[PDB]
């Protein structure tokens, strides 16, 4: 039978930004049917979109990097993408290499660089890269090419070589898919859904290192499942008996029910909630599988 | 009965530094019984040392930061450690908060900062932090207090607040435990072992973003198990029947055996190898559980 890992949400890894899960909530004021490409897996272990098995791949990419200096722009990096295991990136039935960011804004990335200009020879260099929207850098990760740059008074004298770019911070974050193919079509995991009337998406929330105004809120990003649940479905071989699983999220010490929900076999969780504003949950419970249930199974309201 | 997640090593997360597993090897020329504090778990699910469940916690820490400028030194950060889920850190029966680095050298770290200066008000600031050895900064992560600094001509005018430090790079890496308690003793997970005569540690290897001279090798760091194995044992409630599990590492495609090994129930893997130099293995195989075997089970030589 299908089971779940015995891990409290607060001890889990986020599936869209490489950080701890800090929050668990529903918020029907937010887009109901997001088209996230990471954190997407079927109960049967079928990965959707750019979803990787390893949490360390999330919001990262690998590449053959080529550097040039262009006065008035600065140091420009052209990244020829490969998959993070070093295997060749081949345009296929998904938007980008596995783990490639699935949100918009400007990412500060860090890469191992080698310089000939004298000081440290191997070091780590920060670049700025626009994920989206369009009318910026004409990114084409679908075709294996993306662009980043940083202000420099003169050439950094960087040597061409292999990098794995990892995320430092987000500026002008927006939760809409990035520019995957310079305005052209790409294969996308479908919008999350559908939901019964009165059902809403359960969100696993983390907070992103940001560049913002002195008074900004923590920058929230949500996913359908923590990364441990993603790898669990992918590294297991479950047999799907019905459209959904009834889960009960319970206090770990007492067994007190906090809420019941449905894991649709397409990899998203619904609660029955009729309020208009956000409702948060303790992050120190455990999800238990109760039973296969049909699509139309009516949950106890929260 | 015990099973393992069906994941090739090359698609797994490293358990001591937050990066992909790139290499799988034995090397008798290296320390035989390393005292690693991260990536330590029992087959029965007991976490050892500072080992976190989440890969995002590895080589990171959370703290209340207090910053000061000191003419001649630069900006100084005093970090009062918390556990990475935001709960209080209390000195107990391990060296440090969960996921604290278990190696030595100077770690460049990144933290969310807030400044009152003009320009970016929330931004990410890089600091340099000595992990070890002792005779440097008098670090006491065991007691909940560590120090970092960065060169500045003037005060960075940083506001005190909560941070999660994540690693940018390593300088002067050395794979020995860091300064946990200002040169004093701390509770430690024991050395990895023991091995029968002829048995050697299987190493899962990644490479660290580094600061070095032009002609440095990639900076290798080894762990006993990938993080997906660590969370798998911790999230399962496996009954231990004898000292070791016989595993077979097989070519996914051809079904060919590459080697057999013992997963000792104390959370490390042994091969029988009598060479004196390193022997690397393909990273695209699958580990399968054959059975429970006694301590004295004799592996076929590799």
């Amino acid at each position, epitope marked *: 039978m299908v089971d779940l890992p015995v891990i409290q949400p607060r001890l889990c890894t986020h599936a869209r930004w490489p950080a701890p899960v800090y929050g668990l909530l529903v918020d029907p004021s937010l887009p109901s049917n997001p088209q996230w490409q990471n954190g997407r897996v079927h109960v049967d272990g079928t990965l959707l979109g750019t979803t990787p098995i390893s949490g360390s791949w999330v919001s990262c990419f690998a590449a053959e990097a080529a550097y040039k200096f262009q006065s008035g722009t600065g140091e*420009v990096a052209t990244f020829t993408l490969i998959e993070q295991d070093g295997s060749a990136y081949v345009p296929g039935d998904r938007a980008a290499p596995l783990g490639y960011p699935d949100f918009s*804004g*400007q990412l500060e990335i860090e890469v191992q660089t080698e310089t000939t200009k004298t000081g440290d020879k191997l070091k780590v260099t920060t670049f700025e890269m*626009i994920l*989206g929207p369009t009318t910026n850098a004409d990114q084409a990760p679908y075709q294996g090419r993306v662009f980043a740059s940083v202000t420099a008074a003169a050439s950094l004298d960087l040597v061409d070589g292999r990098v794995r770019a990892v995320p430092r911070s987000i*500026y002008g974050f927006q939760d809409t898919i990035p520019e995957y193919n310079d305005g052209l079509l790409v294969p996308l995991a479908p919008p999350i859904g559908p939901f019964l009337p009165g059902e809403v998406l359960l969100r696993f929330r983390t907070y992103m290192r940001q560049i913002d105004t002195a008074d900004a809120a923590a920058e929230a990003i949500d996913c359908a499942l923590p990364q441990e649940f993603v790898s669990w479905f992918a590294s297991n071989a479950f047999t799907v008996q019905s459209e959904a699983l009834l889960l009960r999220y319970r206090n770990t010490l007492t067994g007190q029910l906090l809420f019941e929900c449905k894991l649709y076999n397409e990899g998203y969780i619904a609660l029955s909630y009729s309020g208009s504003g956000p409702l948060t949950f303790p992050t120190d419970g455990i999800f238990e599988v109760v039973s296969w249930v049909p699509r139309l199974y009516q949950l106890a309201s929260v | 009965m015990v099973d393992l997640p069906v994941i090739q090593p090359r698609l797994c997360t490293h358990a001591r530094w937050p990066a992909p597993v790139y290499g799988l090897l034995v090397d008798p020329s290296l320390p035989s019984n390393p005292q690693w504090q991260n990536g330590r778990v029992h087959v029965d699910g007991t976490l050892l040392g500072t080992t976190p469940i989440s890969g995002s916690w590895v080589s990171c820490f959370a703290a209340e930061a207090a910053y000061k400028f000191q003419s001649g030194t630069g900006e100084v950060a005093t970090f009062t450690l918390i556990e990475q889920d935001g709960s209080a850190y209390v000195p107990g029966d391990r060296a440090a908060p969960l996921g604290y680095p278990d190696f030595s050298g100077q770690l460049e770290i990144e933290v969310q900062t807030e400044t009152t200066k003009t320009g970016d008000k929330l931004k990410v600031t890089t600091f340099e932090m000595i992990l070890g050895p002792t005779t440097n900064a008098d670090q006491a992560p065991y007691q909940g207090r560590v120090f970092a600094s960065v060169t500045a001509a003037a005060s960075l005018d940083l506001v005190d607040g909560r941070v999660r430090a994540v690693p940018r790079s390593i300088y002067g890496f050395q794979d020995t435990i860091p300064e946990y308690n200002d040169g004093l003793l701390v509770p430690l997970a024991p050395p990895i072992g023991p091995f029968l005569p002829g048995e050697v540690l299987l190493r899962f290897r990644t490479y660290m973003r580094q600061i070095d001279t032009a002609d440095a090798a990639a900076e290798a760091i080894d762990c006993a198990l990938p993080q997906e194995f660590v969370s798998w044992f911790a999230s399962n409630a496996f009954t231990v029947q004898s000292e070791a599990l016989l595993l077979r590492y097989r070519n996914t495609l051809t079904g060919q055996l590459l080697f057999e090994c013992k997963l000792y129930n104390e959370g490390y893997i042994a091969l029988s190898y009598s060479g004196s130099g390193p022997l690397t293995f393909p990273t695209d195989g699958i580990f399968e559980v054959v059975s429970w075997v006694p301590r004295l089970y004799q592996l076929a030589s590799v």
Partner: nanobody
Amino acid sequence: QVQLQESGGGLVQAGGSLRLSCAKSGRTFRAYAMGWFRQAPGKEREFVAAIDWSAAITNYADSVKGRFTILRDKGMNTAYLQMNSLEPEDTAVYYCAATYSTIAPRTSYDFWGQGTQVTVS
């Protein structure tokens, strides 16, 4: 190459309204502020208003605060200057400019539009 195309200048009476707009075209390689400068005859190019790439930060010249509003969509290539309560002292060529930045700077812009004449009675 970065080009900035302006619309919406011309002649207006004292106390009236105009809306300038500016469209950035050409490939850029990181975030950029959009801004308005102006030059009256015999005077230097002076700062009017600017908005960061995220569209969350605005700076204004003291002489226009409360009268002018700069608008922009997050990450997008079009900026608008809503100019209300215009006065003769506001007569100038208005220049759209853009510059690589994560803020809304008042100086040292790299990219320049053609200028549009604004004339108040």
